mmCIF file with all atom_site columns, N, CA and C and ligand atoms in Angstrom:
data_model
loop_
_atom_site.group_PDB
_atom_site.id
_atom_site.type_symbol
_atom_site.label_atom_id
_atom_site.label_alt_id
_atom_site.label_comp_id
_atom_site.label_asym_id
_atom_site.label_entity_id
_atom_site.label_seq_id
_atom_site.pdbx_PDB_ins_code
_atom_site.Cartn_x
_atom_site.Cartn_y
_atom_site.Cartn_z
_atom_site.occupancy
_atom_site.B_iso_or_equiv
_atom_site.pdbx_formal_charge
_atom_site.auth_seq_id
_atom_site.auth_comp_id
_atom_site.auth_asym_id
_atom_site.auth_atom_id
_atom_site.pdbx_PDB_model_num
ATOM   1   N  N   . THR A 1 1  ? -13.645 -5.686  -8.220  1.00 43.88 ? 1   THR A N   1
ATOM   2   C  CA  . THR A 1 1  ? -12.271 -6.223  -8.220  1.00 43.88 ? 1   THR A CA  1
ATOM   3   C  C   . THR A 1 1  ? -11.805 -6.223  -9.635  1.00 43.88 ? 1   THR A C   1
ATOM   4   N  N   . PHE A 1 2  ? -10.564 -5.854  -9.804  1.00 40.86 ? 2   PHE A N   1
ATOM   5   C  CA  . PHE A 1 2  ? -9.895  -5.833  -11.119 1.00 40.86 ? 2   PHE A CA  1
ATOM   6   C  C   . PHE A 1 2  ? -9.797  -7.177  -11.723 1.00 40.86 ? 2   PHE A C   1
ATOM   7   N  N   . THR A 1 3  ? -10.016 -7.257  -13.007 1.00 41.49 ? 3   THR A N   1
ATOM   8   C  CA  . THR A 1 3  ? -9.725  -8.513  -13.708 1.00 41.49 ? 3   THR A CA  1
ATOM   9   C  C   . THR A 1 3  ? -8.193  -8.733  -13.857 1.00 41.49 ? 3   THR A C   1
ATOM   10  N  N   . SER A 1 4  ? -7.742  -9.924  -14.206 1.00 41.73 ? 4   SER A N   1
ATOM   11  C  CA  . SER A 1 4  ? -6.348  -10.163 -14.408 1.00 41.73 ? 4   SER A CA  1
ATOM   12  C  C   . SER A 1 4  ? -5.795  -9.269  -15.536 1.00 41.73 ? 4   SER A C   1
ATOM   13  N  N   . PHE A 1 5  ? -6.532  -9.109  -16.654 1.00 43.52 ? 5   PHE A N   1
ATOM   14  C  CA  . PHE A 1 5  ? -6.033  -8.338  -17.738 1.00 43.52 ? 5   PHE A CA  1
ATOM   15  C  C   . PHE A 1 5  ? -5.927  -6.852  -17.311 1.00 43.52 ? 5   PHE A C   1
ATOM   16  N  N   . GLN A 1 6  ? -6.855  -6.377  -16.461 1.00 43.08 ? 6   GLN A N   1
ATOM   17  C  CA  . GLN A 1 6  ? -6.779  -5.002  -15.989 1.00 43.08 ? 6   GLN A CA  1
ATOM   18  C  C   . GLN A 1 6  ? -5.530  -4.821  -15.083 1.00 43.08 ? 6   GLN A C   1
ATOM   19  N  N   . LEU A 1 7  ? -5.336  -5.738  -14.116 1.00 44.21 ? 7   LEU A N   1
ATOM   20  C  CA  . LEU A 1 7  ? -4.192  -5.628  -13.232 1.00 44.21 ? 7   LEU A CA  1
ATOM   21  C  C   . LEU A 1 7  ? -2.901  -5.734  -14.022 1.00 44.21 ? 7   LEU A C   1
ATOM   22  N  N   . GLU A 1 8  ? -2.855  -6.642  -15.020 1.00 46.34 ? 8   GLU A N   1
ATOM   23  C  CA  . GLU A 1 8  ? -1.657  -6.748  -15.853 1.00 46.34 ? 8   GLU A CA  1
ATOM   24  C  C   . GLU A 1 8  ? -1.322  -5.473  -16.555 1.00 46.34 ? 8   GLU A C   1
ATOM   25  N  N   . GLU A 1 9  ? -2.319  -4.833  -17.177 1.00 46.59 ? 9   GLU A N   1
ATOM   26  C  CA  . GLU A 1 9  ? -2.038  -3.570  -17.875 1.00 46.59 ? 9   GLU A CA  1
ATOM   27  C  C   . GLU A 1 9  ? -1.629  -2.432  -16.909 1.00 46.59 ? 9   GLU A C   1
ATOM   28  N  N   . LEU A 1 10 ? -2.261  -2.424  -15.748 1.00 48.26 ? 10  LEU A N   1
ATOM   29  C  CA  . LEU A 1 10 ? -1.939  -1.404  -14.747 1.00 48.26 ? 10  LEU A CA  1
ATOM   30  C  C   . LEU A 1 10 ? -0.476  -1.579  -14.255 1.00 48.26 ? 10  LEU A C   1
ATOM   31  N  N   . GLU A 1 11 ? -0.083  -2.844  -13.990 1.00 46.49 ? 11  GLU A N   1
ATOM   32  C  CA  . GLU A 1 11 ? 1.296   -3.104  -13.566 1.00 46.49 ? 11  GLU A CA  1
ATOM   33  C  C   . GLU A 1 11 ? 2.295   -2.841  -14.673 1.00 46.49 ? 11  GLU A C   1
ATOM   34  N  N   . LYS A 1 12 ? 1.962   -3.185  -15.911 1.00 45.50 ? 12  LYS A N   1
ATOM   35  C  CA  . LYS A 1 12 ? 2.872   -2.843  -17.011 1.00 45.50 ? 12  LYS A CA  1
ATOM   36  C  C   . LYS A 1 12 ? 3.072   -1.320  -17.101 1.00 45.50 ? 12  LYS A C   1
ATOM   37  N  N   . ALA A 1 13 ? 1.985   -0.556  -16.924 1.00 46.69 ? 13  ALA A N   1
ATOM   38  C  CA  . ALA A 1 13 ? 2.125   0.889   -16.947 1.00 46.69 ? 13  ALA A CA  1
ATOM   39  C  C   . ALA A 1 13 ? 2.989   1.393   -15.769 1.00 46.69 ? 13  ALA A C   1
ATOM   40  N  N   . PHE A 1 14 ? 2.726   0.843   -14.581 1.00 45.45 ? 14  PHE A N   1
ATOM   41  C  CA  . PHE A 1 14 ? 3.460   1.248   -13.364 1.00 45.45 ? 14  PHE A CA  1
ATOM   42  C  C   . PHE A 1 14 ? 4.959   0.920   -13.487 1.00 45.45 ? 14  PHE A C   1
ATOM   43  N  N   . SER A 1 15 ? 5.259   -0.172  -14.207 1.00 49.50 ? 15  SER A N   1
ATOM   44  C  CA  . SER A 1 15 ? 6.649   -0.569  -14.383 1.00 49.50 ? 15  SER A CA  1
ATOM   45  C  C   . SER A 1 15 ? 7.387   0.337   -15.349 1.00 49.50 ? 15  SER A C   1
ATOM   46  N  N   . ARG A 1 16 ? 6.674   1.121   -16.153 1.00 49.71 ? 16  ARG A N   1
ATOM   47  C  CA  . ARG A 1 16 ? 7.282   2.144   -16.983 1.00 49.71 ? 16  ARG A CA  1
ATOM   48  C  C   . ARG A 1 16 ? 7.498   3.462   -16.229 1.00 49.71 ? 16  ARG A C   1
ATOM   49  N  N   . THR A 1 17 ? 6.546   3.819   -15.401 1.00 50.18 ? 17  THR A N   1
ATOM   50  C  CA  . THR A 1 17 ? 6.632   5.060   -14.586 1.00 50.18 ? 17  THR A CA  1
ATOM   51  C  C   . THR A 1 17 ? 5.653   4.938   -13.459 1.00 50.18 ? 17  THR A C   1
ATOM   52  N  N   . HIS A 1 18 ? 6.061   5.322   -12.279 1.00 49.47 ? 18  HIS A N   1
ATOM   53  C  CA  . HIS A 1 18 ? 5.181   5.433   -11.167 1.00 49.47 ? 18  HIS A CA  1
ATOM   54  C  C   . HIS A 1 18 ? 4.244   6.597   -11.191 1.00 49.47 ? 18  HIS A C   1
ATOM   55  N  N   . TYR A 1 19 ? 4.374   7.521   -12.163 1.00 52.02 ? 19  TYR A N   1
ATOM   56  C  CA  . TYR A 1 19 ? 3.596   8.734   -12.255 1.00 52.02 ? 19  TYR A CA  1
ATOM   57  C  C   . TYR A 1 19 ? 3.012   8.835   -13.667 1.00 52.02 ? 19  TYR A C   1
ATOM   58  N  N   . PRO A 1 20 ? 2.177   7.953   -14.120 1.00 48.42 ? 20  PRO A N   1
ATOM   59  C  CA  . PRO A 1 20 ? 1.620   8.113   -15.465 1.00 48.42 ? 20  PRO A CA  1
ATOM   60  C  C   . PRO A 1 20 ? 0.750   9.357   -15.541 1.00 48.42 ? 20  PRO A C   1
ATOM   61  N  N   . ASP A 1 21 ? 0.875   10.054  -16.642 1.00 46.79 ? 21  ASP A N   1
ATOM   62  C  CA  . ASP A 1 21 ? 0.101   11.268  -16.832 1.00 46.79 ? 21  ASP A CA  1
ATOM   63  C  C   . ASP A 1 21 ? -1.343  11.047  -17.259 1.00 46.79 ? 21  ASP A C   1
ATOM   64  N  N   . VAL A 1 22 ? -2.108  12.126  -17.359 1.00 47.04 ? 22  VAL A N   1
ATOM   65  C  CA  . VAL A 1 22 ? -3.532  11.875  -17.584 1.00 47.04 ? 22  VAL A CA  1
ATOM   66  C  C   . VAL A 1 22 ? -3.801  11.285  -18.938 1.00 47.04 ? 22  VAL A C   1
ATOM   67  N  N   . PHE A 1 23 ? -3.008  11.624  -19.954 1.00 44.11 ? 23  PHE A N   1
ATOM   68  C  CA  . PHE A 1 23 ? -3.235  11.061  -21.298 1.00 44.11 ? 23  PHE A CA  1
ATOM   69  C  C   . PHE A 1 23 ? -3.015  9.560   -21.215 1.00 44.11 ? 23  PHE A C   1
ATOM   70  N  N   . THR A 1 24 ? -1.924  9.122   -20.530 1.00 45.97 ? 24  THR A N   1
ATOM   71  C  CA  . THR A 1 24 ? -1.665  7.689   -20.409 1.00 45.97 ? 24  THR A CA  1
ATOM   72  C  C   . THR A 1 24 ? -2.789  7.012   -19.667 1.00 45.97 ? 24  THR A C   1
ATOM   73  N  N   . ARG A 1 25 ? -3.240  7.649   -18.555 1.00 47.56 ? 25  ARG A N   1
ATOM   74  C  CA  . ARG A 1 25 ? -4.313  7.060   -17.758 1.00 47.56 ? 25  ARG A CA  1
ATOM   75  C  C   . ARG A 1 25 ? -5.613  6.911   -18.565 1.00 47.56 ? 25  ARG A C   1
ATOM   76  N  N   . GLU A 1 26 ? -5.924  7.926   -19.381 1.00 48.02 ? 26  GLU A N   1
ATOM   77  C  CA  . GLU A 1 26 ? -7.150  7.907   -20.179 1.00 48.02 ? 26  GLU A CA  1
ATOM   78  C  C   . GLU A 1 26 ? -7.055  6.838   -21.266 1.00 48.02 ? 26  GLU A C   1
ATOM   79  N  N   . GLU A 1 27 ? -5.924  6.692   -21.899 1.00 48.00 ? 27  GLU A N   1
ATOM   80  C  CA  . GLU A 1 27 ? -5.734  5.627   -22.869 1.00 48.00 ? 27  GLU A CA  1
ATOM   81  C  C   . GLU A 1 27 ? -5.885  4.262   -22.236 1.00 48.00 ? 27  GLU A C   1
ATOM   82  N  N   . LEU A 1 28 ? -5.347  4.086   -21.042 1.00 50.86 ? 28  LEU A N   1
ATOM   83  C  CA  . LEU A 1 28 ? -5.540  2.842   -20.288 1.00 50.86 ? 28  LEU A CA  1
ATOM   84  C  C   . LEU A 1 28 ? -6.998  2.614   -19.976 1.00 50.86 ? 28  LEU A C   1
ATOM   85  N  N   . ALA A 1 29 ? -7.679  3.668   -19.499 1.00 50.35 ? 29  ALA A N   1
ATOM   86  C  CA  . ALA A 1 29 ? -9.129  3.535   -19.153 1.00 50.35 ? 29  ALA A CA  1
ATOM   87  C  C   . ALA A 1 29 ? -9.917  3.030   -20.316 1.00 50.35 ? 29  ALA A C   1
ATOM   88  N  N   . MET A 1 30 ? -9.666  3.629   -21.480 1.00 48.79 ? 30  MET A N   1
ATOM   89  C  CA  . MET A 1 30 ? -10.396 3.178   -22.686 1.00 48.79 ? 30  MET A CA  1
ATOM   90  C  C   . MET A 1 30 ? -10.100 1.737   -23.020 1.00 48.79 ? 30  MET A C   1
ATOM   91  N  N   . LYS A 1 31 ? -8.797  1.356   -22.985 1.00 49.04 ? 31  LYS A N   1
ATOM   92  C  CA  . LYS A 1 31 ? -8.398  0.062   -23.400 1.00 49.04 ? 31  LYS A CA  1
ATOM   93  C  C   . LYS A 1 31 ? -8.977  -1.024  -22.469 1.00 49.04 ? 31  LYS A C   1
ATOM   94  N  N   . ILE A 1 32 ? -8.916  -0.818  -21.157 1.00 48.67 ? 32  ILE A N   1
ATOM   95  C  CA  . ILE A 1 32 ? -9.173  -1.858  -20.193 1.00 48.67 ? 32  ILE A CA  1
ATOM   96  C  C   . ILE A 1 32 ? -10.543 -1.825  -19.599 1.00 48.67 ? 32  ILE A C   1
ATOM   97  N  N   . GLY A 1 33 ? -11.379 -0.847  -19.934 1.00 48.95 ? 33  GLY A N   1
ATOM   98  C  CA  . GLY A 1 33 ? -12.761 -0.860  -19.507 1.00 48.95 ? 33  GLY A CA  1
ATOM   99  C  C   . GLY A 1 33 ? -12.998 -0.401  -18.095 1.00 48.95 ? 33  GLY A C   1
ATOM   100 N  N   . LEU A 1 34 ? -12.151 0.460   -17.561 1.00 48.95 ? 34  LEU A N   1
ATOM   101 C  CA  . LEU A 1 34 ? -12.299 1.081   -16.234 1.00 48.95 ? 34  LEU A CA  1
ATOM   102 C  C   . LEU A 1 34 ? -12.314 2.573   -16.426 1.00 48.95 ? 34  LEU A C   1
ATOM   103 N  N   . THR A 1 35 ? -12.801 3.330   -15.432 1.00 49.01 ? 35  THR A N   1
ATOM   104 C  CA  . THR A 1 35 ? -12.709 4.761   -15.517 1.00 49.01 ? 35  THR A CA  1
ATOM   105 C  C   . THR A 1 35 ? -11.288 5.219   -15.234 1.00 49.01 ? 35  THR A C   1
ATOM   106 N  N   . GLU A 1 36 ? -10.937 6.378   -15.804 1.00 49.83 ? 36  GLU A N   1
ATOM   107 C  CA  . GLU A 1 36 ? -9.662  6.985   -15.488 1.00 49.83 ? 36  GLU A CA  1
ATOM   108 C  C   . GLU A 1 36 ? -9.548  7.296   -14.013 1.00 49.83 ? 36  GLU A C   1
ATOM   109 N  N   . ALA A 1 37 ? -10.654 7.588   -13.331 1.00 49.09 ? 37  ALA A N   1
ATOM   110 C  CA  . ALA A 1 37 ? -10.601 7.924   -11.923 1.00 49.09 ? 37  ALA A CA  1
ATOM   111 C  C   . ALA A 1 37 ? -10.223 6.691   -11.112 1.00 49.09 ? 37  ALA A C   1
ATOM   112 N  N   . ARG A 1 38 ? -10.805 5.542   -11.426 1.00 48.72 ? 38  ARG A N   1
ATOM   113 C  CA  . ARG A 1 38 ? -10.484 4.306   -10.717 1.00 48.72 ? 38  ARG A CA  1
ATOM   114 C  C   . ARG A 1 38 ? -9.015  3.973   -10.907 1.00 48.72 ? 38  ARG A C   1
ATOM   115 N  N   . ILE A 1 39 ? -8.534  4.139   -12.138 1.00 46.01 ? 39  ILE A N   1
ATOM   116 C  CA  . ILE A 1 39 ? -7.124  3.877   -12.485 1.00 46.01 ? 39  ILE A CA  1
ATOM   117 C  C   . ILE A 1 39 ? -6.190  4.866   -11.754 1.00 46.01 ? 39  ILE A C   1
ATOM   118 N  N   . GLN A 1 40 ? -6.573  6.135   -11.728 1.00 45.70 ? 40  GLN A N   1
ATOM   119 C  CA  . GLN A 1 40 ? -5.795  7.158   -11.039 1.00 45.70 ? 40  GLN A CA  1
ATOM   120 C  C   . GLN A 1 40 ? -5.639  6.809   -9.566  1.00 45.70 ? 40  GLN A C   1
ATOM   121 N  N   . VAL A 1 41 ? -6.726  6.418   -8.894  1.00 46.08 ? 41  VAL A N   1
ATOM   122 C  CA  . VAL A 1 41 ? -6.646  6.043   -7.511  1.00 46.08 ? 41  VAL A CA  1
ATOM   123 C  C   . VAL A 1 41 ? -5.811  4.824   -7.315  1.00 46.08 ? 41  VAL A C   1
ATOM   124 N  N   . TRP A 1 42 ? -5.876  3.848   -8.240  1.00 43.60 ? 42  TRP A N   1
ATOM   125 C  CA  . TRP A 1 42 ? -5.035  2.667   -8.150  1.00 43.60 ? 42  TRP A CA  1
ATOM   126 C  C   . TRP A 1 42 ? -3.558  3.080   -8.131  1.00 43.60 ? 42  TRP A C   1
ATOM   127 N  N   . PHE A 1 43 ? -3.167  3.971   -9.052  1.00 42.84 ? 43  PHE A N   1
ATOM   128 C  CA  . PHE A 1 43 ? -1.771  4.433   -9.072  1.00 42.84 ? 43  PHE A CA  1
ATOM   129 C  C   . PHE A 1 43 ? -1.405  5.163   -7.764  1.00 42.84 ? 43  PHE A C   1
ATOM   130 N  N   . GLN A 1 44 ? -2.290  6.042   -7.266  1.00 44.18 ? 44  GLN A N   1
ATOM   131 C  CA  . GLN A 1 44 ? -2.007  6.719   -5.987  1.00 44.18 ? 44  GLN A CA  1
ATOM   132 C  C   . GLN A 1 44 ? -1.779  5.695   -4.878  1.00 44.18 ? 44  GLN A C   1
ATOM   133 N  N   . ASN A 1 45 ? -2.667  4.699   -4.838  1.00 46.58 ? 45  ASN A N   1
ATOM   134 C  CA  . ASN A 1 45 ? -2.644  3.692   -3.766  1.00 46.58 ? 45  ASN A CA  1
ATOM   135 C  C   . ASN A 1 45 ? -1.400  2.829   -3.887  1.00 46.58 ? 45  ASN A C   1
ATOM   136 N  N   . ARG A 1 46 ? -1.001  2.464   -5.105  1.00 47.59 ? 46  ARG A N   1
ATOM   137 C  CA  . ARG A 1 46 ? 0.207   1.666   -5.310  1.00 47.59 ? 46  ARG A CA  1
ATOM   138 C  C   . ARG A 1 46 ? 1.468   2.493   -4.958  1.00 47.59 ? 46  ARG A C   1
ATOM   139 N  N   . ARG A 1 47 ? 1.452   3.781   -5.240  1.00 47.65 ? 47  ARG A N   1
ATOM   140 C  CA  . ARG A 1 47 ? 2.557   4.648   -4.799  1.00 47.65 ? 47  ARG A CA  1
ATOM   141 C  C   . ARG A 1 47 ? 2.611   4.694   -3.257  1.00 47.65 ? 47  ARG A C   1
ATOM   142 N  N   . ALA A 1 48 ? 1.498   4.770   -2.570  1.00 49.72 ? 48  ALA A N   1
ATOM   143 C  CA  . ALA A 1 48 ? 1.517   4.795   -1.146  1.00 49.72 ? 48  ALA A CA  1
ATOM   144 C  C   . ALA A 1 48 ? 2.075   3.470   -0.585  1.00 49.72 ? 48  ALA A C   1
ATOM   145 N  N   . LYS A 1 49 ? 1.722   2.354   -1.163  1.00 47.41 ? 49  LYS A N   1
ATOM   146 C  CA  . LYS A 1 49 ? 2.205   1.051   -0.738  1.00 47.41 ? 49  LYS A CA  1
ATOM   147 C  C   . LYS A 1 49 ? 3.743   1.007   -0.951  1.00 47.41 ? 49  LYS A C   1
ATOM   148 N  N   . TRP A 1 50 ? 4.228   1.518   -2.081  1.00 49.66 ? 50  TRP A N   1
ATOM   149 C  CA  . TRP A 1 50 ? 5.632   1.534   -2.411  1.00 49.66 ? 50  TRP A CA  1
ATOM   150 C  C   . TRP A 1 50 ? 6.417   2.360   -1.400  1.00 49.66 ? 50  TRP A C   1
ATOM   151 N  N   . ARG A 1 51 ? 5.922   3.536   -1.048  1.00 47.31 ? 51  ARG A N   1
ATOM   152 C  CA  . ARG A 1 51 ? 6.616   4.418   -0.121  1.00 47.31 ? 51  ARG A CA  1
ATOM   153 C  C   . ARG A 1 51 ? 6.633   3.821   1.266   1.00 47.31 ? 51  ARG A C   1
HETATM 154 CL CL1 . CL  B 2 .  ? -10.787 12.099  -11.678 1.00 43.55 ? 101 CL  B CL1 1
#
């Protein structure tokens, strides 16, 4: 389960764009201590919820 700081950073990124690119995702992964793959799936899943 995501920590609060991880979810906060993920939502801040999503609020800038629903389609963050791989460079943005990788920078997030490094900063927040998750893999880029986990973060990528989170964005896919949040886009599916939005649609
Ligand atoms: Cl991947």
